[PDB]
Amino acid sequence: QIRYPVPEESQEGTFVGNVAQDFLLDTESLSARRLQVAGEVNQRHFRVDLDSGALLIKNPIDREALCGLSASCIVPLEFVTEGPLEMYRAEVEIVDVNDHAPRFPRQQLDLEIGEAAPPGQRFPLEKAQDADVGSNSISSYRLSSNEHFALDVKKRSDGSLVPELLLEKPLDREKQSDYRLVLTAVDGGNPPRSGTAELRVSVLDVNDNAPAFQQSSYRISVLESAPAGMVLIQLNASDPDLGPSGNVTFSFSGHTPDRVRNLFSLHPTTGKLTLQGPLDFESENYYEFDVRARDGGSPAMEQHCSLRVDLLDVNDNAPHITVTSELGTLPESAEPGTVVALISVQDPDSGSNGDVSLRIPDHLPFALKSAFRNQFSLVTAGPLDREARSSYDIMVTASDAGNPPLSTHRTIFLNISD
Amino acid sequence: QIRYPVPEESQEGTFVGNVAQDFLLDTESLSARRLQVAGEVNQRHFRVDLDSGALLIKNPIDREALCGLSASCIVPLEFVTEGPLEMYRAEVEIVDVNDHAPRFPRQQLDLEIGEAAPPGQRFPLEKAQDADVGSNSISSYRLSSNEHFALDVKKRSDGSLVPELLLEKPLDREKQSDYRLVLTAVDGGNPPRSGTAELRVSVLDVNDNAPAFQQSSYRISVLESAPAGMVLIQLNASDPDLGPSGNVTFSFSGHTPDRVRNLFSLHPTTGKLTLQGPLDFESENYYEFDVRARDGGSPAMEQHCSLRVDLLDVNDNAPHITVTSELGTLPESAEPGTVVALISVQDPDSGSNGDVSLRIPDHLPFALKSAFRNQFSLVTAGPLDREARSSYDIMVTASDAGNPPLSTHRTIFLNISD
């Protein structure tokens, strides 16, 4: 087999080989035998010189259009002479040149990756095309510097490279939602030729954040006289997720007792906590309960918060006077110290607001004695004479130590007999 | 201050204290002084024995109805004597007993936790109620043995416990979707009393699985004569998620070239890959393309798979005989060795299916000569005499080396002249 190598895309008139010498034809015989290539197609690309007997390129040859991705491109040639008419055979090897640069069919590649994609997941990329073969084909892929993505290039069944995008670090759309990358494919030509593609990565949102309250817990003070409809506090919570998944609404915890719901209500949009009814420090001095903020995701994320409402005592009770026992009538002969009445006082308020003092006018022949807390006896403190006064209206005044103090008035009526 | 402790729910006649001796009353004069409890309410629960002067329980006292959740329960008592008329005061401390067991308001508690909940996330639980106070109130919560959940119990300023369920290890609904737990609350009484609640936690599904092919790649061999509509392979992929997120459908990759789409089709539900048109080993010997499986989730998860289809050569071409040149007429005086015809053969099949041998009948005065691959010249091999035979019909037979071989027949017609 006579084999001539010649590079593809060679100019018209390029020397391939001297077939006349290799077929053992005489030079003078060459001008007579009129050696020519047989076959209509091959006459477009090859020609035989009548003077030298050289096989020459007629029209440039494209190896890619002829053999595609085959490793070797060999063109069998047949020749004809006259006198006598004879046929000869030779093979022309078309040697590949690097007339193709790597090129991605689309130069804009867009990937949408979920925010919760696990590191180690591979994402396919469309590979560049290089119609050349051998070392002139694609030799490596490159990915521009970044912090979350790397390249994982796989070799498929024939030995072509298949590039895949590999997630190295977890994503977080709340920190970075978009990545702009450049992907490069380079062949092993001399010099290497390359082509690039722009890779835009989008991070899709997951509902991975619960709402966050402004403070971890709230403690509030309110006077027990506060009217219904007063705003105690406005709860604020934020959620960084997108759309309804970042939309915060407020409510009581599911386990909130009705004793809380009776006095407090929570506006679902504004988070304003209002007072719904009368408070009373004397019955309950504080309330502890939990509230929650929910996002509008499906399903929803929840966050709880602890609320404490402290009541402040108000001096809303005047002292209560109990006259336990009462003489009614007293002999004018009674010795000083005679008990006229037993008196008890109570004030339900706290601290100084509930501390009671008792008094009567000085000018009376009576006095107040106390042996135990909040207990007073009304006794005679001087002599009595019916002819002077037949009866006494003894004005008793109880007062608490609030500011200002509140007073209670009670009159003990006492008849005097002989 | 005279203070007597007495446990709540004590029977009638229980000894509280010797008030007379603490009030410093003469022992011989009790029947005269007639020490008595003052106040209608306190007279329902306490009475003074006239002979001994001891304060006794009349009707049993409920500490819970009196003080609720307060730590200390103190009842001021007032007493009255006659001869002389006097008032005395003492305090009774009502001591809590352990007459309340812990009790959850609901015996069935249900939690729905997302499969992708991060470890360390907390979930509220409805606390049990124990109306007692002090050591008789709830002292600890317990959670049955398990591997993913623990308790995080918070202590408030008054001593109330707030139980929270704490996720310790990551969940996976594809491995276990339901957890059955019992939650227990115990007080610190002697003996300790407790109550339980049934806790059912369910794991909600996330679309965290892409479909999985049975094999990482498939390689198929098919004869180039295979008829249209033949099933080459059935792709199988599973997706363990729930609902549409676990429903798999098949398709070609988005970038699949039309030369592939023209010959192969993929049923979206069954995954059967069928043949759509004629194959030809002589023009194309293999096809490589990617297929994908998508679930019905929103957004959809997909996994790609690489397919390679290799064609097998069939002996579907008999050799082709080309008679390049033919003398047609020959003089009987011509010397042996004269070339009568030029013959080239070709068979497009590969291997033994494409190797051609040539022959002619033995008895003829002709022979076949070959100087180049697949080129034969028909020459005279003996003397020729016109008077004997004026013309020859030379039967040339080409055969390939297939089993069974395929043959081609061509006759060279030759006239002889004088």
Ligand SMILES: *[C@@H]1O[C@H](CO[C@@H]2O[C@@H](C)[C@@H](O)[C@@H](O)[C@@H]2O)[C@@H](O[C@@H]2O[C@H](CO)[C@@H](O[C@@H]3O[C@H](CO[C@H]4O[C@H](CO)[C@@H](O)[C@H](O)[C@@H]4O)[C@@H](O)[C@H](O[C@H]4O[C@H](CO)[C@@H](O)[C@H](O)[C@@H]4O[C@@H]4O[C@H](CO)[C@@H](O[C@@H]5O[C@H](CO)[C@H](O)[C@H](O)[C@H]5O)[C@H](O)[C@H]4NC(C)=O)[C@@H]3O)[C@H](O)[C@H]2NC(C)=O)[C@H](O)[C@H]1NC(C)=O
């Ligand atoms: C993707 O997945 C698909 C589906 O997978 C299946 O379905 C899913 C849902 C799962 O359950 C999965 O586990 C399943 O596998 C899968 O396609 C299947 O591929 C299988 C092979 O890989 C194939 O199995 C064959 O089934 C034949 C019967 O099928 C009939 O019934 C089924 C179910 O009802 C129908 O779908 C189907 O259309 C048919 O109607 C079965 O006969 C084959 O076994 C014979 O052949 C074997 C090798 O060819 C051989 O090893 C076996 O031993 C058996 O050989 C026969 O043995 C009997 C008894 O010994 C002989 O009978 C006796 O003969 C003696 C004389 O010899 C005497 O006459 C006695 O009297 C007589 O009883 C008989 O002669 C033997 N035959 C031969 C030819 O030798 C084989 O098991 C499934 O059908 C496929 N399913 C479908 C739905 O198509 C794909 O493979 C997966 N894809 C990939 C890429 O893997």
Ligand SMILES: *[C@@H]1O[C@H](CO[C@@H]2O[C@@H](C)[C@@H](O)[C@@H](O)[C@@H]2O)[C@@H](O[C@@H]2O[C@H](CO)[C@@H](O[C@@H]3O[C@H](CO[C@H]4O[C@H](CO)[C@@H](O)[C@H](O)[C@@H]4O)[C@@H](O)[C@H](O[C@H]4O[C@H](CO)[C@@H](O)[C@H](O)[C@@H]4O[C@@H]4O[C@H](CO)[C@@H](O)[C@H](O)[C@H]4NC(C)=O)[C@@H]3O)[C@H](O)[C@H]2NC(C)=O)[C@H](O)[C@H]1NC(C)=O
């Ligand atoms: C939950 O969030 C809400 C809302 O938050 C606000 O909106 C968010 C979108 C975001 O932007 C966030 O940053 C905002 O703060 C909270 O409610 C807000 O609370 C703050 C603080 O408690 C209040 O600020 C006060 O604003 C008034 C003016 O408010 C008028 O105009 C507002 C619009 O700009 C309206 O929204 C109001 O309705 C009202 O019409 C200021 O006057 C206050 O400053 C003065 O008083 C404080 C002490 O209270 C002093 O420290 C300051 O120095 C100011 O004093 C004045 O100074 C001038 C000049 O020196 C002097 O001439 C005056 O005499 C001084 N006056 C006095 C009285 O000394 C505050 O800045 C917001 O009004 C309130 N907004 C709403 C809508 O309610 C809420 O607190 C939060 N929840 C929790 C638990 O934190």
Ligand SMILES: *[C@@H]1O[C@H](CO)[C@@H](O)[C@H](O)[C@H]1NC(C)=O
């Ligand atoms: C939340 O939902 C309401 C309707 O309920 C809508 O008007 C609002 O725009 C949404 N987003 C925010 C941030 O409030």
Ligand SMILES: *[C@@H]1O[C@H](CO)[C@@H](O)[C@H](O)[C@H]1NC(C)=O
């Ligand atoms: C997928 O959805 C279709 C809708 O009709 C249903 O018929 C089919 O059974 C589903 N897939 C599986 C694997 O069940």
Ligand SMILES: *[C@H]1O[C@H](CO)[C@@H](O)[C@H](O)[C@@H]1O
């Ligand atoms: C692509 O890459 C090749 C090799 O790195 C370069 O030679 C070319 O200029 C292009 O940048």
Ligand SMILES: *[C@H]1O[C@H](CO)[C@@H](O)[C@H](O)[C@@H]1O
């Ligand atoms: C790679 O770089 C080329 C320019 O060399 C661009 O055309 C391409 O879009 C990518 O950025």
Ligand SMILES: *[C@H]1O[C@H](CO)[C@@H](O)[C@H](O)[C@@H]1O
């Ligand atoms: C709750 O726990 C207490 C103390 O462990 C038991 O006595 C009771 O039976 C219940 O199981």
Ligand SMILES: *[C@H]1O[C@H](CO)[C@@H](O)[C@H](O)[C@@H]1O
């Ligand atoms: C805890 O266990 C008790 C039985 O000891 C049940 O009655 C209760 O409902 C919970 O399961």
Ligand SMILES: [Ca+2]
């Ligand atoms: Ca070319």
Ligand SMILES: [Ca+2]
């Ligand atoms: Ca080339």
Ligand SMILES: [Ca+2]
């Ligand atoms: Ca190239």
Ligand SMILES: [Ca+2]
């Ligand atoms: Ca995030």
Ligand SMILES: [Ca+2]
């Ligand atoms: Ca998010």
Ligand SMILES: [Ca+2]
């Ligand atoms: Ca959210």
Ligand SMILES: [Ca+2]
């Ligand atoms: Ca009050």
Ligand SMILES: [Ca+2]
């Ligand atoms: Ca008060």
